[PDB]
């Protein structure tokens, strides 16, 4: 009873190669299977949508990773764009071995795949973050293929008006991978936010946009920033932490402003309605561009009583702080707003987005929690208490309490022990001393009577750096040793970039080398078969920052405090031949009224590369199919397949 | 309290700071792993944020950490002009002197006598100022912009010889045109009657003749099945005699084609699709060997031919010809054989009835001749496609002659009235499908409407095999007859409900027709047009005649157009949207110069010293 197993990412992007995995199971060791895999749309009489690729996997080396090309022209010919009920293409494996030997109803076995024209990465850069009407806008767009190397495909750049009305469209075919173009904002344009969108010509939903703001502004001379003492304010009964904030005004070039700061306070609700205080205005001279302004507990509550808001009503309100610094004897003023400063009942805020659901009986359930300080960077050395209550059906629910401190990166890995035949699990995790930030969740156990489970265990539990080799321990749970190998594969950016097998042993350790192909994260789906049914268990593994391999290092001749008109020497260091695209920006523009959105950096680039990832959740699954679905895979072993995804997102 | 009698550095000696770009170093360049490019710092005192992107063929994208370049001058002059200045209005300039040196400076600040500006003294009058170390000293300058377009005013601050420090800044203040700014929003509508409209040319009196006249157009597009389980279960391998094989093949072909057209093959595993194709191939061969010498397709070779089953087989094989590499000439012969059986008046005989009448659908009854005539014509029409474009020309023309004769005969029978629901339903579909004459087609359509039934929402014509089949034929007729209008949607909804019952579509004649109708309905509903709304504007302005276009096939569009007088519109396309042309011009606007809500009045009393007076 052999099986031929077909693996492929659940979504196929037209115009880029598709990674497919074919692997045998339970072969008599004396027969070699040959065949071909291709995409075909049954809606048009099984017309192939891609050239056939053959695998010819044998018993000695069953696993075989092969790539399928999906040119745009082939898709058009087979009629994939004429479909009416959503995008759906079939990937099939044609092999006479199926019908003749296994005695199957037909010599074909395939999986249903969704398809999308989204491909490549487009990065748009604008001259300035904010413009004013009548000024010329200079924007350039970089075209990149899937592998992050520069591409030379035709793109169309359309600029949209503040109301969403297109005011430009230029279909430009570009061999340099950089396309510089400019236009002029109408002199009558009302203040608003524009948008520059770019997409590949052949692709239809492969767009990418960058927003720039149009606003009538005059370039400010100095910058004012209001920094509260703590980004949070405790509102627990009895204790109300004092509210002290610091105000700093500094000329753009660096020297400290010398003026007067006029401050007004108020409250904001969720929508944004303001309820200004009266008589609480504080005005103070700026000494060395500093003014420590605080509200005494006595006067704050008096204002609350005057507004009859009450302490209890401070649920999610924000304490407004607006300054109107007026440099003297300059005469100009600039204003800062401090919308982001909340009233909270606890300083810390647990995040349980990395703790995988779907526990596996018999193995230590690993709990992952990120202790991030309220509206701030992750904090360290914060004891976190978890009380897991395993609900054994045949006895009283046992309660386990285990305590651990944050490692130092804000992440805590607390392994709890779960016995077999457990109905469900309920654990409450609370980090804080005092004022815990309680968070709780319940994970139901898998249905009983199924095949033994697979337990993926990572001894390190830290995000590996590019170039490292993390080790994973695979262990079958509650099943016989009939199987003789562990099959695993690695997914990165919705592509099976590695497939292999590991022999079963007492301690099965698999060394996974994390190169740049695996970033900013990758999955790890490993499966073993208990005779006839499949068993699998995935594991999402993050990766560290992994700075670009390009290694562009902008540098200047130290810090000599250049005068206006002096000739600076900009040193450009690069690891290979490259097209350095430079832009010098006046930081006063950032001070000028705006959202202060971040510019292009690795946060956006890695988000771009990981935008193609198909898997959702921290991994794990109730059944083999669910874990394959969660990891973003399409699976079919003949008698058990994976349903096509309902949407391009989970 | 003393002056300086020209003991200040020369005015021309100090450099002038005039280049103030908010963004300067904009360039894409190639680097051979190392490059130093010299730059010329613009004359603005800020902290430049230099950043770059590396796009190499091998490595890929590699963003770089910004370099915070800081340019700063110890003693400088900050001139901040207002965003908007109105001509012939008092203007206050406050160029502040920033002295970050560790010394006390006495400096002379004066605005160069640029033409178009009237200074307080009418020229370059100096204003001595004492700037203590690490302090700012504003030097107010009241000017009235009398120019027309713009004036470049430079403020020169030349210090004393005690510490010779000076700086000068040159800026251009933009004097906007006299009069306020007005907006004229002219909303409109668009449609496929009411096509052409003309927007009246502007004739307001407040408009200033000499000035700007900008017009913008803003067009907005303003755009507004049966279970795959049961149908899949209909795929069965044909077996039995020449009749029972078609019992199992006709549903199989319909189910395969229904899913093919409804695009429901994704739900089922891909093995089923090829399993369906293989079954069709096997069935095609299985029935092909029941064919007689003259394409009769009888139940048994010994038994005489039946025209009913020959037409049914011809219809089935003709549809399956697309996905099966069949032989057209065999179908051509079968069509030729059918033409022989035609009677004098255009009917069809069927000398030998089929062994089992259960597959005949709603045919058994008082009326049979009209049903067969219409049924054969539907089969005959389906056989037109299989006919090869090259050769066999006479065979086709004979078919169009006979089918027309059958179409004519159906006309008298349908027009005669008192026809059953089944006979009327098939007749209406046959005439509509075969492009029957309008008069006969028109009567047949309304005759069927008369026999129609309506018991509630999504109810028309559990249910008997006759009603289900008759409804399917009517739905096919309605869909092909001037599209679908509030009745195919309502009618087909009943068919889906009737087909969703366990073991629905009891017979095969209903199953093949019903699945044919629903598939036709589904493809009709889930389809969209271009919805283009391209509009062209033309006007004969001062510059002459100009034209524009705005294709809205997909979004919304805005476009600059140089039309200064009455304009014309030419809307086209079925899509309906919104067009609104907005025109902006300067009007003769006046208001208080004085404050309206918050007022401040200040007066000075005493004796003030002077140096130069009128």
């Amino acid at each position: 009873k052999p099986r031929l197993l077909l693996f492929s990412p659940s979504v196929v992007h037209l115009g880029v190669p598709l990674s497919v995995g074919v692997q045998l199971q339970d072969v008599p060791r004396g027969q070699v299977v040959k065949g071909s895999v291709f995409l075909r749309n049954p809606s048009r009489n099984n017309v192939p949508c891609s050239p056939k690729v053959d695998f010819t996997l044998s018993s000695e080396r069953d696993f075989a990773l092969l790539s399928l090309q999906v040119p745009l022209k082939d898709a058009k010919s087979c009629g994939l764009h004429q479909l009416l009920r959503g995008p759906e293409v079939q990937l099939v494996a044609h092999s006479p071995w199926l019908k003749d030997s296994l005695s199957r109803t037909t010599n074909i076995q395939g999986i249903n795949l969704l398809f999308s024209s989204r491909r490549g990465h487009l990065f748009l850069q604008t001259d300035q973050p904010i413009y004013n009407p009548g000024q010329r806008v200079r924007y350039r767009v970089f075209a990149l293929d899937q592998k992050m190397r520069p591409s030379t495909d035709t793109i169309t750049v359309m600029v949209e008006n503040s109301h969403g009305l297109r005011v430009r469209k230029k279909e430009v075919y570009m061999p340099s991978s950089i396309f510089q173009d400019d236009f002029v904002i109408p002199d009558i344009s009302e203040p608003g936010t524009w948008k520059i969108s770019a997409r590949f010509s052949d692709g239809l939903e492969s767009n990418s946009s960058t927003q720039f703001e149009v606003k009538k502004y005059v370039l400010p001379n100095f910058e004012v920033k209001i920094t509260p003492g703590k980004p949070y304010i405790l509102t627990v009964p009895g204790h109300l932490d004092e509210m002290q904030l610091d105000i700093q005004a500094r000329y753009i070039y660096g020297k400290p402003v010398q003026g007067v700061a006029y401050v007004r306070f108020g409250l904001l609700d969720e929508d944004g309605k303001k309820t200004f205080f009266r008589g609480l205005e504080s005005q103070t001279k700026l000494v060395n561009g500093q003014s420590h302004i605080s509200l005494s507990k006595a006067e704050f509550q008096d204002a609350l009583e005057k507004l009859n808001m009450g302490i209890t009503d401070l649920q999610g309100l924000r304490l407004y702080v607006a300054a109107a610094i007026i440099e003297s004897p300059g005469g100009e003023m600039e204003e800062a707003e401090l919308t982001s400063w909340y009233f909270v009942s606890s300083p810390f805020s647990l995040d349980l987005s990395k703790t995988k659901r779907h526990l596996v009986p018999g193995a230590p359930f690993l709990l992952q929690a990120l202790v991030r300080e309220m509206s701030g960077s992750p904090a360290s050395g914060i004891p976190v208490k978890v009380s897991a209550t395993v609900s054994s059906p045949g006895s009283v629910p046992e309660v386990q309490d285990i305590q651990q401190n944050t490692d130092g990166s804000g992440q805590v890995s607390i392994p709890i022990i779960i016995p077999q035949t457990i109905s469900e699990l309920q654990l409450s995790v609370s980090a804080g001393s005092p004022h815990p930030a309680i968070a709780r969740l319940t994970v139901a156990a898998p249905p009983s009577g199924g095949p033994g489970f697979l337990s993926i265990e990572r001894p390190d539990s830290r995000p590996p750096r590019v170039g490292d080799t993390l080790n994973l321990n695979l262990r079958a749970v509650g099943s016989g040793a009939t199987f003789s190998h562990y099959y695993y594969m690695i997914l990165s950016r919705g592509q099976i970039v590695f497939m292999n097998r590991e022999p079963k042993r007492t301690l099965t350790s698999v060394s996974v080398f994390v190169d740049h192909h695996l970033a900013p994260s990758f999955y790890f789906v490993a499966f073993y078969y208990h005779g006839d049914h499949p068993v699998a268990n995935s594991l999402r593994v993050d990766v560290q920052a992994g700075a670009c391999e390009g290694k562009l290092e902008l540098s200047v001749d130290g810090a000599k405090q250049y005068r206006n008109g002096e000739s600076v020497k900009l040193h450009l260091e690069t690891d290979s031949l490259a097209l350095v695209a430079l832009g010098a920006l006046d930081t006063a523009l950032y001070a000028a009224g705006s959202k202060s959105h971040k510019p292009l950096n690795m946060g956006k680039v890695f988000e771009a590369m990981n935008s193609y990832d198909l898997g959702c959740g921290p991994g794990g699954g109730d059944s083999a199919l669910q874990v394959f679905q969660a990891a973003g895979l399409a699976f079919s072993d003949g008698d058990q397949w994976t349903l096509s995804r309902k949407r391009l997102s989970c | 309290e003393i002056l300086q009698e020209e003991d200040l550095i020369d005015e021309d000696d100090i450099p002038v700071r005039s280049f103030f770009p908010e963004n300067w170093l904009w360039r894409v360049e190639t680097v051979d792993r190392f490059q130093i490019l010299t730059l010329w710092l613009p004359d603005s005192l800020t902290t430049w944020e230099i950043h770059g992107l590396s796009l190499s063929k091998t490595k890929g994208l590699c963003v770089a950490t910004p370099v915070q370049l800081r340019v700063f001058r110890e003693f400088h002059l900050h001139l901040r002009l207002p965003m908007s200045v109105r001509r012939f209005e008092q203007l206050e300039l406050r160029p502040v002197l920033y002295n970050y040196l560790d010394k006390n400076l006495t400096v002379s600040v004066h605005v160069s006598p640029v033409e178009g500006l009237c200074l307080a003294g009418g020229g370059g009058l100096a204003q001595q100022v004492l700037v203590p170390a690490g302090s700012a000293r504003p030097v107010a300058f009241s000017v009235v912009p009398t120019a027309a377009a713009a004036v470049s005013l430079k403020v020169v601050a030349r210090g004393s010889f005690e510490f010779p420090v000076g700086d000068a800044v040159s800026k251009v203040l933009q004097i906007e045109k006299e009069g306020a700014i007005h907006r004229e929003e002219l909303v409109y509508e668009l449609n496929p009657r009411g096509r052409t409209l003309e927007i009246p040319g502007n004739s307001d009196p407040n408009m200033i003749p000499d000035g700007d006249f900008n017009s913008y157009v803003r067009v907005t597009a303003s755009d507004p099945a049966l279970s795959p389980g049961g149908v899949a279960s209909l795929l069965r391998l044909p077996r039995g005699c020449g009749e029972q094989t078609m019992i199992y093949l006709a549903p199989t072909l319909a189910a395969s084609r229904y899913l093919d057209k409804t695009e429901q093959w994704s739900t089922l595993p891909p093995e089923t699709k090829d399993h369906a194709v293989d079954l069709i191939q096997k069935g095609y061969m299985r029935i092909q060997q029941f064919r007689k010498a003259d394409g009769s397709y009888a139940a048994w070779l010994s038994r005489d031919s039946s025209t009913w089953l020959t037409a049914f087989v011809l219809k089935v094989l003709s549809l399956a010809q697309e996905q099966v590499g069949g032989s057209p000439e065999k179908l051509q012969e079968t069509s030729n054989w059918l033409l022989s059986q035609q009677q004098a008046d255009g009917s069809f005989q069927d000398p030998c009835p089929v062994l089992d009448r259960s597959m005949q659908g709603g045919l058994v009854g008082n009326d049979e001749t009209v049903a067969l005539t219409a049924f054969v014509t539907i089969a005959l029409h389906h056989g037109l496609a299989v006919f090869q474009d090259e050769g066999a020309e006479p065979l086709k023309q004979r078919v169009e002659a006979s089918i027309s004769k059958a179409n004519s005969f159906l006309g008298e029978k349908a027009s005669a009235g008192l026809l059953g629901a089944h006979a009327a339903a098939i007749t209406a579909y046959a005439l509509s499908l075969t492009k029957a004459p309008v008069d006969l087609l028109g009567v047949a359509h309304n005759n069927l409407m008369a026999m129609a039934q309506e018991t509630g929402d999504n109810l028309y014509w559990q249910a008997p095999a006759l009603w289900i089949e008759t409804t399917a034929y009517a739905l096919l007729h309605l869909l092909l007859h001037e599209g679908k209008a509030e009745m195919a949607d309502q009618a087909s909804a009943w068919l889906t409900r009737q087909g969703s019952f366990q073991g629905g579509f009891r017979s095969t004649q209903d199953t093949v027709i019903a699945l044919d109708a629903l598939s036709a309905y589904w493809i009709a509903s889930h389809t969209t047009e271009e919805r283009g709304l391209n509009v062209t504007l033309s006007s004969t302005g001062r510059n002459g005649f100009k034209s524009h276009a705005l294709q809205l096939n997909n979004l919304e569009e805005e476009l600059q157009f140089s039309l200064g007088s009455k304009i014309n519109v030419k809307v086209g396309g079925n899509s309906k949207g919104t067009l609104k042309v907005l025109r902006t011009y300067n009007v003769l606007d006046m208001k208080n110069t004085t404050c309206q809500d918050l007022q401040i009045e200040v007066t000075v009393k005493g004796h003030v010293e002077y140096t130069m007076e009128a």
Epitope: - | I9, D10, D13, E74, F163, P164, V165, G166
Partner: nanobody
Amino acid sequence: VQLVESGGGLVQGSLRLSCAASGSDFSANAVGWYRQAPGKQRVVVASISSTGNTKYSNSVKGRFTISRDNAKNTVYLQMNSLKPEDTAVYYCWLFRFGIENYWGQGTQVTVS
């Protein structure tokens, strides 16, 4: 940039009292001389602008001329009709970019 000046000495009088500049784009930048008499603060005695527009301190204006030539990157303060209160130590003043000031060692002159 280094400023070098010389030529000061006792006289009954006229002194060439020339000064040279260590390059660094001597032309296109203002230059002049400073008088530093004993006790009182350093003051301007005569200066020449880049364009050639000469300026003299009103106290001793019009007596001794100032000449700047770009041939050898030097300046002169030729003296004449020396007054007994003129005894002071003079300095060679350079003024480049409009904010940078430089002064040399300074030579002292005596009168009889």
